[PDB]
Structure formats: C-alpha cells, structure tokens
C-alpha cells in the first residue's frame, strides 16, 4: 500500500527506462541475456558482436545503492526468465551449494510451467546477489565453467583476492557512479509526487555528499520530509554535514590523501585535523605503513621549511620510518602491545608524509616489499636446502 512502504521500494524502477544512469551497462546486460540462447546453440565456440558468445556467465559490481539488483531483476523479468536467487541470508557452503542449485543448473521451472506468449518463461536465471558475503568461491567458479542456464553474480569489490578466480570466467559488467541529471529528474518526479518542495541546486550537493548512492538519497529525502517538507539552499550545508558518509578508503587513495600537501597547510588543518589522519590510517593499518614508505621519495615536496632541501626532508622522514619499524616490532612480538597502534600510526604514516607532501613525481606504485620479501624467503629456503645437502 501507500504511506506504509519504504520510499526506496515504492519508487523502485518498473522498466529499464526508469534507471538513473548506467544506460550502457544495462544495455550491455540486456544484449548479453537476450543472446545467451544463440550462444548456447553455437556451443560457446566463438564470440558474438560484442563478445557475449564466449561467456555463459556475467558479474556486476559497483558502489552500493546504484542499481545492480534492480537492473538484474528487470532484465530477468522483461525477457520472462524465471528468477532463482541465492543470497547471504541463506547458506552458500560447498556441501549445501552442491546440495542446492546444482541440480537446478539444468532443470526447468515448475512455477514457469504453472504460470504460463511467454516463450522463454520456462528457464532458470541464477542470481548470487552479495557474492562478497562468503570453498564457496571455488564452487561458484566451477559452476560458471559448466552451466546450462543463464548465470550472473552481484558483488561490490572485484579487486578482493577472494574473487580472483572470477578473473576470466565471467563477462564483467562494471557499474559506476551515475551522472546527476537522471537522479535530478527522478527526484523532481518524486518531489512533485509526494507534495514536498525540492530546489534544483540541492540535488547536486546531495549526490556529492552521499557519494552517488541513490537509495541513501531517497532515504534522506524521506527523513527530511518527515518533519521539514521544504528543502532550500539554507539548510543544505547542515543536512550535508549531518548525513555525510564516512566511507573507508583504498590503500592507493589513502597514500594519495596522506601525501597531499593541502592537509598539512595552516588553512587545510582546521577541518582535516591530525585525528582525521589517524582515523584515515586506521582504515588499512597493514598497507599504509608499506604504502607511505615506497612513494614518500617520489614526489615534489610542497611543505619544505625555509633553508631545507628535499633530501633533508627525505632523510628526516626516513628516520621516523625507521622508528616506526621498531615500534611495530614491539607491537608484533611476544609482548604483544596493541595499545601502541596510535603511536605507530603517527611515526609510520603521518610524520613521514608531513615533510614530503606534494604532487606525485610519477604515480603511486603498489608496494614491492611484499613481493621482494616473498622471493627472499623462498631464496632463503633454497639456500638452506643446499647448505644442508652439502654439509
């Protein structure tokens, strides 16, 4: 009914012409699922016009709340394919996955028999929504290799190593942050439908602060309209600050934000205090010390003190990096003093990057100490083998 259903549910898209942005990705998904049967008749021995003939499976990722689930549902329903979804609320263990949709990989829809012309309303389309909520990944990959039904997966972060086996077993379709025009039009329709006034310049800031999360934008509109139906440019900053989303940050972006010269400026420190720097370090405390060390010497410094050269700043940062090494060794030892993490945060990320801050000389490189250490460990093992053999 109305007035007793969530705004993000009653205003869900009804067709593929009601999706805000991601027109290319939805179009690609529609083409892939509209030509799977032709690829099946081709026995998957060659690609199609867009390359859909080689991949019997696809996977969707993107930021939350942008329309992956809605696009999947509408694409499955428009062609009549019967939806068969597995979710994180149910078990995806290897034994139960083999005891679950494994038989459904080539069966038929009995409800499709009873429901119904709907020529292709007689098949399963399989939906692992929330793949990241996991030997489940191995079983899913082996399903992707051998499946007699359309199959897609929905996750959020491909870059995680646990979906690494999905590297070339699925037709990747990437969803991005939608452009503000379609969301602007959708909120205009919603505002004129739900009696509350909305100001066009406000949608841009709402999308900017919400970081392209349409569902959270609808929730924000509902919550504001509960007591203050009028949205103007007066309380825009108040609402943006109250509903700001403290999203976690990726290691490369962590290194970029840490090495930016503005945050250590006098003006830039009023809002981005060093407490925010500690909180930013603590997002990924295992990669930030390694990321800072490998690119703190490949920038133009912009916070050089008068009479101080770039090399002096590099040396003074290396001193505190060496101190952070000793702090970490005390942290990860038999004593196991984990109350020392805030000190390691400063000495390993904040102070060394507070002297070499500036634009990149090249670009932020992935940490190489991990690979070098692994190769050194294997070389040590082989050295021990020959040492003991010849002894």
């Amino acid at each position: 009914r109305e007035e007793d259903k969530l705004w993000t549910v009653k205003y869900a898209p009804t067709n593929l012409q009601q999706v805000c942005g991601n027109k290319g990705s939805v179009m690609k998904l529609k083409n892939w699922l509209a030509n799977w049967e032709n690829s099946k008749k081709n026995s998957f021995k060659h690609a199609g016009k867009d390359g859909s003939g080689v991949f019997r499976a696809a996977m969707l990722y993107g930021p939350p709340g942008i329309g992956k689930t809605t696009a999947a549902h509408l694409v499955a329903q428009e062609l009549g394919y019967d939806i068969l979804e597995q979710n994180a609320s149910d078990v995806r263990s290897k034994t139960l996955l083999n005891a679950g949709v494994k038989n459904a990989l080539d069966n038929m829809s009995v409800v499709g028999y009873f429901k119904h012309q709907n020529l292709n309303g007689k098949h399963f389309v399989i939906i692992m929504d929330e793949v990241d909520g996991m030997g489940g990944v191995g079983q899913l990959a082996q399903f992707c290799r051998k499946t007699s039904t359309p199959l897609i997966l929905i996750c959020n972060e491909r870059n995680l190593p646990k979906m690494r086996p999905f590297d070339r077993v699925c037709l990747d379709i990437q969803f991005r942050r939608p452009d503000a025009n379609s969301i602007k039009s959708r909120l205009m329709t919603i505002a004129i439908r739900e009696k509350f006034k909305l100001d066009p310049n406000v949608i841009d800031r709402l999308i900017q602060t919400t970081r392209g999360d349409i569902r959270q934008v609808i929730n924000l509109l509902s919550t504001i309209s509960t007591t203050t139906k009028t949205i103007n440019h007066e309380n825009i900053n108040e609402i943006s600050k109250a509903w700001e989303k403290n999203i976690a940050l990726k290691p490369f972006d962590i290194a970029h934000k840490m090495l930016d010269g503005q945050i250590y400026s006098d003006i830039g420190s009023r809002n981005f205090t060093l407490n925010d720097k500690i909180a930013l370090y603590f997002d990924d405390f295992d990669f930030t010390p390694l990321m800072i060390q490998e690119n703190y010497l490949s920038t133009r410094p912009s916070v050089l003190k008068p009479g101080q050269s770039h090399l002096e700043a590099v040396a003074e940062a290396a001193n505190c990096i060496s101190l952070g090494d000793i702090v970490e060794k005390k942290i990860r030892s038999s004593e196991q003093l984990w109350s020392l993490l805030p000190l390691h945060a400063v000495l390993s990320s904040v102070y060394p990057a507070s002297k070499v801050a500036g634009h990149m000389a090249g670009r932020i490189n992935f940490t190489a100490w991990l690979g070098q250490n692994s190769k050194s460990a294997k070389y040590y093992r082989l050295l021990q083998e020959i040492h003991y053999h010849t002894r």
Binding site: E3, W7, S89, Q216, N219, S222, W243, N246, L323, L337
Partner: protein, 320 residues
Amino acid sequence: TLSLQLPWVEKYRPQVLSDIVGNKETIDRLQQIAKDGNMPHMIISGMPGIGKTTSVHCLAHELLGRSYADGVLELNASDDRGIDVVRNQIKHFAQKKLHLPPGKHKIVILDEADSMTAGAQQALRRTMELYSNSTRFAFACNQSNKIIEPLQSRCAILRYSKLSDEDVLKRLLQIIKLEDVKYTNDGLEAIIFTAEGDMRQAINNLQSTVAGHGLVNADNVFKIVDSPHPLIVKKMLLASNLEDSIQILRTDLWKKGYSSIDIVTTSFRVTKNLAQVKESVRLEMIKEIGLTHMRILEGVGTYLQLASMLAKIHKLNNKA
C-alpha cells in the same frame, strides 16, 4: 539484606520521546516518525551516555503498544549474535506473521551493533532488503565505522551530538524538583563541568553527592568526585614554565594516585586532540610522548620518566 532502591539513572529513565533533552531536531524527527508510523531503517551513533538506546526503546514503545511483548525483537552483545545461530532467529522473526495496526511494523533492535562480525551484517543486508514491508531495523552503536557500507546504504543516519550544558542543567533541575534535595547553582555547574556532556555520569555524580553529603554544594561535589584528569593533563602540557608543569604533574596526578601509563595515554590523547599549537609541534610532541610510552610499557614506570617527558615537551615547545 533489604531490597535496593532503584538508582536514579534507571528510576528517572524517560518513557516518552518528549523527556529526552538535547538534539532537538533529531528528537522532533523521531516524534514525527512516531505519529506518522512510517519508520525507516536507521542507525544511531554518538558518544556514550547521551541518550541513544533510550530513544530507540521509547520509539519502539510508542509506535506499537500492547504488541511490545512479541512485536519487537531486541538483541544485544549479551546475546550471542553470530552469523549462523542468529540469522535463523531474525529470519523467522521477520517471516513471522503478526497483525499490527496499519501504519506500524515489527522492530528489530540490534542494540550495540558495532560489535557484530562482518558475515552477520552481510546476511542482514539481504534480510533487510527482502522483508522491508514487514520488519524494520534499529541499529544503536557508539561507533558507526564498524558498520559496513552496504548497511549504511539502506539506513537513515541519525547522528546524536553531545548534550549542551543548558539541556543537562534543565533535566537535572527537573530531577531535583522531583526529588526535593537542597541544591546550589555552583554545585550544579560543578556537576555539569565534571560530567562533560555525559548525562549518566551527571546523574551518578548527583547520586553520590546527595547520598554522601546531603547538600550538592561545590565543595562536596569536588570532595566526592574529582575533576576530569584530561583537563589537568591539558593544563600541564600547555604551561610555559617547566617548574609549573612539574608541580602540576606531581601534585595533581602523582599525589592523587594516578598510574604513569594513564598519564601517558591521556597526554597522547590530549596532544592528538589539541589544536592551539602548530601541527608540526604536535607531531614532535606525539613522537616524544610515544617514546616515553614505549619506555613505560617496557617495564620502567617512574616519576622520572614523566618528568623527562615534560622536560623534552618543554624543549620542543620553547623552540630550544
């Protein structure tokens, strides 16, 4: 052993949304949700003791009445909220068919939600997305960082802020007038200063002072409860004379019975939360405080180490 009187913290817990003071906009929005009935999924966050879970309980009581015995499932850290034995519980509760008023839904109070594992929240993602028509969730966590971003993408962010002194004073005066205890404005401002916007701390200090001396005058308040040592540490670190800093250290912390590690941790927290002095100066102050922290944790805890820490802090502060 006579039955104990209920403490004033729990005796005067609010039962309606009107009695909660502070964050007027959030309370008014909660009231509009209460009479409207269209409760969305929300996450409530803030510093401890400012009225997070009491607002959740009051809203759950107001939205649905006699159905409160079975129409709300409350969970907490004392319940073993895991991925496996508990997904079935919320799955059944959301799938449970109970007849409500037309504009009311079942409420799942996942109180203290920042302590759950990642997999539990991953299951809760689709659990919330599926039965959004029947059940609604209410997270109440001190820190919102532990909650994953898919959960934040489908929840209404209700951030509580620390209570202003006026609202704490107003509700305190209400409590005095209901209890009829002799009070002095200096004592009340002492309670406000000691509480630091933590309401339960204010009520507990009021209890201790009332039942310890009868009068809540400022001298009795400072006799019973001590001033917060973060303020003393901030005063000590910001002094200009080294002798003054050493005297403050000794008299106010070493002779008051404060462990050295507590002083070091409080100094680190004050320095990282301080903003008056230059950023770089705070960086070397943090480095030196951390060196003293390593010395303390390695075994040697002595007044001499704290004195050396203060001496080097003054060396950096006075610019050689």
